């Protein structure tokens, strides 16, 4: 796995790319 | 929030797995 | 056919932008 | 489905809020 500060169209696709076949949630609200 | 987690700080292979439904 | 693994990467990317700060929830079923 | 709405059909920015929180 890559260890970075996840931001940008770099992390979202990772959260998706990692979580895979299950699902995910995004909270822009802090 | 969560940004403080992975974008504010570096995230690992499982800290996001907490964020899956 | 049409491949969704790929379809999602664009969708989720774009969604981030569009949904903005209110955030979003990605369910890979529907 | 959402992947059903933009895959076989392209969608525009407004038409994406339908899936936004
Ligand atoms: Cl960047
Ligand atoms: Cl593609
Ligand atoms: Na990209
Ligand atoms: Zn970038
Ligand atoms: Zn593509």
CA atoms within 13 A on the CB side of A1: 18
CA distance B19 to A23: 9
Write out chain A residues lying below 8 Å of B7, CB-based: 5-7, 11
CA distance C28 to C25: 10
Contact between chains at C19 and A25 (C-beta distance less than 8 A):
no
C-alpha distances in Å from residue A21, one per residue of A9, B13, C5, C15 = 19, 16, 9, 18
B2 is written with which tokens?
A: 């969560």
Within chain B, what is the greatest distance between any pair of CA atoms?
A: 22
Report chain A residues touching chain B, CB-CB < 8 A: 1, 3-7, 11, 14-15, 18-19, 22-25, 27, 29-30
């Amino acid at each position: 796995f890559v260890n970075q500060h996840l931001c940008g169209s770099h992390l979202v696709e990772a959260l998706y790319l990692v979580c895979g076949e299950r699902g995910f949630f995004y909270t822009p609200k802090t | 929030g969560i940004v403080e987690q992975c974008c504010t700080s570096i995230c690992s292979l499982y800290q996001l797995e907490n964020y899956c439904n």
